[PDB]
Design an enzyme around this catalytic site. Sequence first.
Site, mmCIF file in Angstrom:
data_model
loop_
_atom_site.group_PDB
_atom_site.id
_atom_site.type_symbol
_atom_site.label_atom_id
_atom_site.label_comp_id
_atom_site.label_asym_id
_atom_site.label_seq_id
_atom_site.Cartn_x
_atom_site.Cartn_y
_atom_site.Cartn_z
ATOM 1 N N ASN B 8 0.862 -1.180 0.000
ATOM 2 C CA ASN B 8 0.000 0.000 0.000
ATOM 3 C C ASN B 8 0.917 1.256 0.000
ATOM 4 O O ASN B 8 1.757 1.424 0.887
ATOM 5 C CB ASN B 8 -0.896 0.006 1.229
ATOM 6 C CG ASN B 8 -1.878 1.149 1.227
ATOM 7 O OD1 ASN B 8 -1.505 2.279 0.911
ATOM 8 N ND2 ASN B 8 -3.154 0.864 1.552
ATOM 9 N N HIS B 11 1.221 6.078 2.157
ATOM 10 C CA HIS B 11 2.075 6.983 2.900
ATOM 11 C C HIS B 11 3.184 7.646 2.066
ATOM 12 O O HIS B 11 3.752 8.634 2.516
ATOM 13 C CB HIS B 11 2.557 6.379 4.218
ATOM 14 C CG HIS B 11 1.482 6.343 5.231
ATOM 15 N ND1 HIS B 11 1.536 7.093 6.372
ATOM 16 C CD2 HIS B 11 0.256 5.762 5.217
ATOM 17 C CE1 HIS B 11 0.403 6.952 7.041
ATOM 18 N NE2 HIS B 11 -0.394 6.147 6.367
ATOM 19 N N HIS B 43 -5.534 3.524 -1.371
ATOM 20 C CA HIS B 43 -6.844 3.941 -0.908
ATOM 21 C C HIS B 43 -7.157 5.391 -1.357
ATOM 22 O O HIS B 43 -6.616 6.365 -0.836
ATOM 23 C CB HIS B 43 -6.890 3.816 0.630
ATOM 24 C CG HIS B 43 -8.224 4.114 1.221
ATOM 25 N ND1 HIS B 43 -8.443 4.105 2.582
ATOM 26 C CD2 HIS B 43 -9.387 4.510 0.650
ATOM 27 C CE1 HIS B 43 -9.690 4.464 2.822
ATOM 28 N NE2 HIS B 43 -10.291 4.707 1.661
ATOM 29 N N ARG B 45 -9.371 7.993 -0.852
ATOM 30 C CA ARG B 45 -10.393 8.366 0.109
ATOM 31 C C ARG B 45 -11.324 9.417 -0.501
ATOM 32 O O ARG B 45 -10.910 10.182 -1.372
ATOM 33 C CB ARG B 45 -9.719 8.961 1.312
ATOM 34 C CG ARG B 45 -8.851 7.972 2.062
ATOM 35 C CD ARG B 45 -8.036 8.640 3.113
ATOM 36 N NE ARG B 45 -8.954 9.427 3.921
ATOM 37 C CZ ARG B 45 -9.655 8.951 4.953
ATOM 38 N NH1 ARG B 45 -9.506 7.679 5.382
ATOM 39 N NH2 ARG B 45 -10.494 9.775 5.592
ATOM 40 N N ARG B 49 -7.305 12.789 0.932
ATOM 41 C CA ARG B 49 -6.243 13.103 1.853
ATOM 42 C C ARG B 49 -4.844 12.752 1.302
ATOM 43 O O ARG B 49 -3.884 13.491 1.498
ATOM 44 C CB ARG B 49 -6.473 12.286 3.118
ATOM 45 C CG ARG B 49 -5.316 12.226 4.065
ATOM 46 C CD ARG B 49 -5.651 11.244 5.148
ATOM 47 N NE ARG B 49 -6.934 11.603 5.761
ATOM 48 C CZ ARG B 49 -7.443 11.013 6.840
ATOM 49 N NH1 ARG B 49 -6.777 10.046 7.457
ATOM 50 N NH2 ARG B 49 -8.626 11.408 7.310
ATOM 51 N N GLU B 70 -8.448 0.367 -2.659
ATOM 52 C CA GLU B 70 -9.289 0.361 -1.483
ATOM 53 C C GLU B 70 -10.222 1.521 -1.617
ATOM 54 O O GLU B 70 -9.801 2.640 -1.931
ATOM 55 C CB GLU B 70 -8.475 0.506 -0.214
ATOM 56 C CG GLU B 70 -7.472 -0.630 -0.050
ATOM 57 C CD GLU B 70 -6.543 -0.444 1.140
ATOM 58 O OE1 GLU B 70 -6.790 0.475 1.933
ATOM 59 O OE2 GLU B 70 -5.638 -1.283 1.346
ATOM 60 N N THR B 101 -17.102 -0.569 15.473
ATOM 61 C CA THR B 101 -16.265 -0.116 16.589
ATOM 62 C C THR B 101 -14.804 -0.602 16.493
ATOM 63 O O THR B 101 -13.890 0.067 16.967
ATOM 64 C CB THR B 101 -16.846 -0.593 17.963
ATOM 65 O OG1 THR B 101 -16.919 -2.027 17.969
ATOM 66 C CG2 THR B 101 -18.236 0.024 18.233
ATOM 67 N N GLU B 149 -10.343 -9.653 3.908
ATOM 68 C CA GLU B 149 -9.075 -9.195 4.456
ATOM 69 C C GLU B 149 -9.280 -8.956 5.923
ATOM 70 O O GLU B 149 -10.082 -8.111 6.308
ATOM 71 C CB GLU B 149 -8.554 -7.940 3.713
ATOM 72 C CG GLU B 149 -7.148 -7.531 4.222
ATOM 73 C CD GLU B 149 -6.494 -6.380 3.487
ATOM 74 O OE1 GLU B 149 -6.903 -6.085 2.336
ATOM 75 O OE2 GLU B 149 -5.536 -5.802 4.084
ATOM 76 N N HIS B 212 -3.275 -4.114 8.115
ATOM 77 C CA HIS B 212 -3.358 -2.996 9.089
ATOM 78 C C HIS B 212 -2.368 -3.233 10.212
ATOM 79 O O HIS B 212 -2.588 -4.131 11.007
ATOM 80 C CB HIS B 212 -4.714 -2.817 9.761
ATOM 81 C CG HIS B 212 -5.673 -1.959 8.995
ATOM 82 N ND1 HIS B 212 -6.394 -0.950 9.588
ATOM 83 C CD2 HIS B 212 -6.018 -1.949 7.685
ATOM 84 C CE1 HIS B 212 -7.162 -0.364 8.679
ATOM 85 N NE2 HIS B 212 -6.952 -0.950 7.516
HETATM 86 C C1 PXP Z 1 -7.762 -2.819 3.907
HETATM 87 C C2 PXP Z 1 -6.331 -2.354 4.209
HETATM 88 N N1 PXP Z 1 -5.364 -3.289 4.228
HETATM 89 C C3 PXP Z 1 -4.078 -2.951 4.508
HETATM 90 C C4 PXP Z 1 -3.703 -1.625 4.711
HETATM 91 C C5 PXP Z 1 -2.237 -1.328 5.010
HETATM 92 O O1 PXP Z 1 -2.170 -0.977 6.386
HETATM 93 P P1 PXP Z 1 -0.847 -0.384 7.002
HETATM 94 O O2 PXP Z 1 -0.538 0.938 6.336
HETATM 95 O O3 PXP Z 1 -1.099 -0.267 8.463
HETATM 96 O O4 PXP Z 1 0.216 -1.431 6.750
HETATM 97 C C6 PXP Z 1 -4.685 -0.636 4.699
HETATM 98 C C7 PXP Z 1 -4.376 0.843 4.918
HETATM 99 O O5 PXP Z 1 -4.792 1.352 6.198
HETATM 100 C C8 PXP Z 1 -6.003 -1.007 4.433
HETATM 101 O O6 PXP Z 1 -6.971 -0.035 4.399
#
Ligand code: PXP
Lengths: 259, 259
Positions: B8, B11, B43, B45, B49, B70, B101, B149, B212
């Site tokens: 992903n 960042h 993602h 959004r 962002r 995403e 939650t 996932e 995540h």
């Molecule tokens: C569904 C999903 N999987 C994986 C990730 C990757 O997560 P992370 O950046 O914490 O490794 C994200 C981004 O928050 C996500 O939305």
Amino acid sequence: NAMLLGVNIDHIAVLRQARMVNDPDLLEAAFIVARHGDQITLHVREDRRHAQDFDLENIIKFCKSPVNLECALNDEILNLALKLKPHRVTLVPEKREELTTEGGLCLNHAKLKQSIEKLQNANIEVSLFINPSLEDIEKSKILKAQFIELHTGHYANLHNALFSNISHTAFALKELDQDKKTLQAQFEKELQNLELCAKKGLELGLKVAAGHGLNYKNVKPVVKIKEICELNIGQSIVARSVFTGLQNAILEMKELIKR
Amino acid sequence: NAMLLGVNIDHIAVLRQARMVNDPDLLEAAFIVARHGDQITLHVREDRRHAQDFDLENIIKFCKSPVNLECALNDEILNLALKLKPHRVTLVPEKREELTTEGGLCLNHAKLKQSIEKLQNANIEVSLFINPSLEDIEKSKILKAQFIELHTGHYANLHNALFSNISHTAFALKELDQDKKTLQAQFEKELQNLELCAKKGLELGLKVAAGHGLNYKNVKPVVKIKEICELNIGQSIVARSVFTGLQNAILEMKELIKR
Ligand code: PXP
Ligand code: PXP
């Protein structure tokens, strides 16, 4: 006259604060800067957007490098500087009252003179981040600054518009949507002016640094200005580090500023 | 069963949007992911962002890799998916109505079933990002998801609290300020549960991914869950890349997930 490189680590802290999991670790990054840069720079903003009080404390306590704290004229951050005693403080604008239209510090600010005195009384070197104008240079001399740092931001944006693809991207600056000839004239003037201001600074006994927007392409004509002794660069280095790692990003920049 | 790695790149776009000078260039980074990862994840959004519409377009148009978008259940981003046709869409919560939650998607959302249908009708693979509960797994099967996932976020935070220094830092989670024994019991349960849910997913014919919070330390027990075929990881990789460069950050992670 070998050019010195201050590495601003603000954008490593930007990444960290984006997820709040202490990763990247700013102190790790600061160790790399200590070793391969000439100073470590960070801006602890009043709003604590990126670098934090504890970052300044940690770096001062742990890193074998001079530290340059950038900060504005609020008492809280000034007091912190006075408590921790970085080697250098670079006074920068954050609030409207501190700002000029071009982005350097407003040298008429009511608190500026006393702030400088407080810092120098504590044996902290003081740098003023200023617009490249001969008037601001002369005032900086009057205010007894040891250093001035010329704002290369307009130069950088001009260079980017002229010699990169930025105008074809979503990041294009509407203000630089003008014909190439006008841009090219402004670019030449801006570079000429940076040189003139550095010479003036040097003539008045000031040490002259430069920073904002400098990157691996637009830095090259700035290195040829003999009278600038130091560049302070952050964002472009952290952006390169995503591809090469911070060590190599710093070392690459050091190679470019050899003269 | 070699584990697949989705990178992903959100960042990297966070860094880019921090200065608005197209640096780091997300398409450059995407080329590196295409080569060394197994899929490129981003993602886009509703609030834009970080990753942008043009990023999805560019990556789809230029990168030799499957693309996993995403997105949430808003029409604008769904339509974009339908127009551009990434290989896979992972439905994630962004608005309150989509949220649970614990952080997985609310599988009772009114638009969820039709959204899935629209995507599958367009021959886009659909993954549901869900809490690790047996109930959510069974519903995901009913909704005809090809993938699920599992949200490793709580697992990750527990691992961090137990086996790193995070509790001694400003990033400590107040909710995990509890004694080590309780934390250790919760950690074991959470890991046990992830395994149970993966097995259940696999039993129902679903492909099972996880993501995540995964990092170079907490990933190791997750790799031992045979029934998870794919990890989606972003923030920890981009944070490592500041030190090693993105290529090496990806390759390091690939080495850890060998089994
Ligand atoms: C569904 C999903 N999987 C994986 C990730 C990757 O997560 P992370 O950046 O914490 O490794 C994200 C981004 O928050 C996500 O939305
Ligand atoms: C006075 C000063 N010099 C240099 C820098 C480094 O600028 P950049 O991140 O654009 O290289 C900054 C940070 O904006 C700064 O405030």
